[PDB]
Amino acid sequence: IEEVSNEEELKAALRDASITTIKLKNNITLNNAITINNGNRNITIIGDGHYINALNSDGGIILNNRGGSAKIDLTIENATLYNTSKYGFVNMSSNGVDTVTYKDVTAYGGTLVWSKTGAGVKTLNLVGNTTLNSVKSYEVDGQSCGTEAFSHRTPDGDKTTALYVSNAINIAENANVVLNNSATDIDMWLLTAVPSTSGISTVTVGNNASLTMENIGNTEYNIKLDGGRENHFIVNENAAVKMSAKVDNVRIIPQLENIFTRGNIELAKGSNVHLEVITGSNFRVAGTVANRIDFNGTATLIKQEG
């Protein structure tokens, strides 16, 4: 119930508080970031195989509600998404709840999705056959674009990441999600900061889903969990997980000395998890974290000699 063919039409549709469904009729190039800050929104972009290329370092789509109780649910289906911004194609910057869903999406960027870590619950759902590419540059219709990557301090120096989503990344049941990283230090970085409403950081892989992040040539940590109160990696029944990284596959180490948190990793019956690192630990947990790892399926954890 709304068709768009260029930047101005897309901007108009997204900034229109009554608009819920948007269909791309053409590939769209964005020279400017588009801000959504007009309250409760339920938005679906139907890509129909088209791309959106966010060229502005300012961002692509910026969620920026000022009110704590406003909720934005943004879904993008069947599209290719490009961005150069270190703040992602989508920048989840509302004070309240932002939820982003990619379904059958292919994406290219340095940092592909970014969020505020000291506010409302930030969720990225990854659905169907979705492939995310963290790259140093990309080319579309003959134009090459360099990317920037979001960087943030850690006790082991500054690290960059492909996904900086504060609270949850969920791989939907039956999904086939692939993340290719040749650009950043971390594939998924979920962090909460003191003023977070929840302090929970969670990655889930749904029933019969697959998650593949074979980035041992590039990535230091596949998943870094920095929730102030809880950190979860949940692999459900019959899910297939394959990950590789230079240092750790999952890292739960507090960013600071005054953080007393929890970690829970659950690998369900029927799941098949294959993990490989070079110099660290497949599941690396250290510091004041109360941690529990439940192995109820089949898992293989490998460390190369180094």
What are the DSSP calls for 11-40, one per residue? HHHHT-TT--EEEESS-EEESS-EEE-SSS
Domain count, the chain: 1
What is the Cβ-side half-sphere exposure of residue 229, based on CA atoms within 13 angstroms?
A: 8
The C-alpha atoms of residue 44 and residue 285 are separated, in whole angstroms, by 38
Residue 253 structural domain: 1-306
Determine how many CB atoms are found less than 10 A away from the CB of residue 254: 18
To one decimal, the resolution in angstroms is: 1.9
Beta-strand relationship, 113-115 and 163-164? parallel
By what method was this entry solved? X-ray
252: which residues sit within 8 A by CB, 6+ positions away?
A: 225, 226, 231, 261, 263, 283, 284, 285, 286, 289, 291
- DSSP structure string for 50-114: -EEEE--TT-SEEE---STT-EEEEEEEEEEEEE--TTBSEEE--SSEEEEEEEEEEEEESS-EE
DSSP-based three-state secondary structure for 9: helix
Collect all residues with Cβ–Cβ distance below 8 Å to 305 and sequence separation of at least 6: none
What one-character DSSP code corresponds to residue 161? B
